[PDB]
Amino acid sequence: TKKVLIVEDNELNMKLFHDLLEAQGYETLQTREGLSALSIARENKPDLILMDIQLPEISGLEVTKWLKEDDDLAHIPVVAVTGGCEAYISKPISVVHFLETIKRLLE
Ligand SMILES: [Mn+2]
Ligand SMILES: [Mn+2]
């Protein structure tokens, strides 16, 4: 099963991403904090990371740099939600566009 780690501080955005990804048969991991994202990534080895750039406590871009600096996490594709990111998506989120981008990198 594909695993997508969702790093999003907003509950509404978090649920949507979660709901859409799960409906596609993907497993998901969730955290509102960039630092926890690093921990979870090493512990669960997700296949893709959906990174909110505008986190309140820290720059998602700085978390992405830490990811790319870790030999064990650098290979994991990172999709930015608005540098080391393989793709980006803007809000209002387009469901099809969102899902296509992720599948494109995962499948
Ligand atoms: Mn957010
Ligand atoms: Mn779930």
From TrEMBL:
Pfam families from the UniProt entry: Response_reg (PF00072)
Signal peptide stretch: none
Source superkingdom: Bacteria
Modified residues (4-aspartylphosphate): D52
Keywords: Metal-binding, Phosphoprotein
GO molecular function: metal ion binding
Coiled coil: none
Positions of Mg(2+) binding: E8, D9, D52
Residue numbers binding Mn(2+) 1: E8, D9, D52
Record SMART domains: REC (SM00448)
Residues of the Response regulatory domain: 3-106
Residues where Mn(2+) 2 binds: H18, E22
Name this protein carries in UniProt: Polar differentiation response regulator
Organism for this UniProt entry: Caulobacter vibrioides (strain ATCC 19089 / CIP 103742 / CB 15)
